[PDB]
Write a protein that binds this DNA or RNA. Structure first.
Ligand SMILES: [Zn+2]
Ligand SMILES: [Zn+2]
Ligand SMILES: [Zn+2]
Ligand SMILES: [Zn+2]
Lengths: 71, 74
DNA sequence: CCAGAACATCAAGAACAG
DNA sequence: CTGTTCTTGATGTTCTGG
């Protein structure tokens, strides 16, 4: 019943596994406009309801990594 | 011959609340400075703040400030 | 020159529309 | 569900009085 990216709330399957409302919207806007998001630390940046915004780079790869795509 | 931000690195504005800050940094501080922002760091309070990633970790940023010795006036 | 106020952006997460 | 638009907090850049 929970997201597999941020771990918050699941809304359904989108471009792959379960995602939160935002993780859905994020993944697209993100992977499409190809923006080299660079982590600010050591890439392990824990992502969740509270922090997911803090670092697109880490969030984004968590997507590809946890299975996700555009088609 | 260029003055640089002691916090973000962007083009420095002036001596604000304590040090050579960038435009935003000045403001950024004052706002959060005294307020319940409750910013949360991602990793270990040791991120690297530069003009293009200052938005990422507020916590670290502000902390860097307090560390650089900024202030409002006690 | 600087601390603030005032006016202007960005972008994330929610609410919609098809 | 997926594509698009709206709302709003967090930020940024100008404009002001002392
Ligand atoms: Zn999520
Ligand atoms: Zn990160
Ligand atoms: Zn700065
Ligand atoms: Zn941080």
């Amino acid at each position: 019943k929970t997201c597999l990216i941020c771990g918050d709330e699941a809304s359904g399957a989108h471009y792959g596994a379960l995602t939160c409302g935002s993780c859905k919207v994020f993944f697209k806007r993100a992977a499409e406009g190809k923006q080299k998001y660079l982590c600010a630390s050591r890439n392990d940046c824990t992502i969740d309801k509270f922090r997911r915004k803090n670092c697109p780079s880490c969030r984004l790869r968590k997507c590809y990594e946890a299975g996700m795509t555009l088609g």
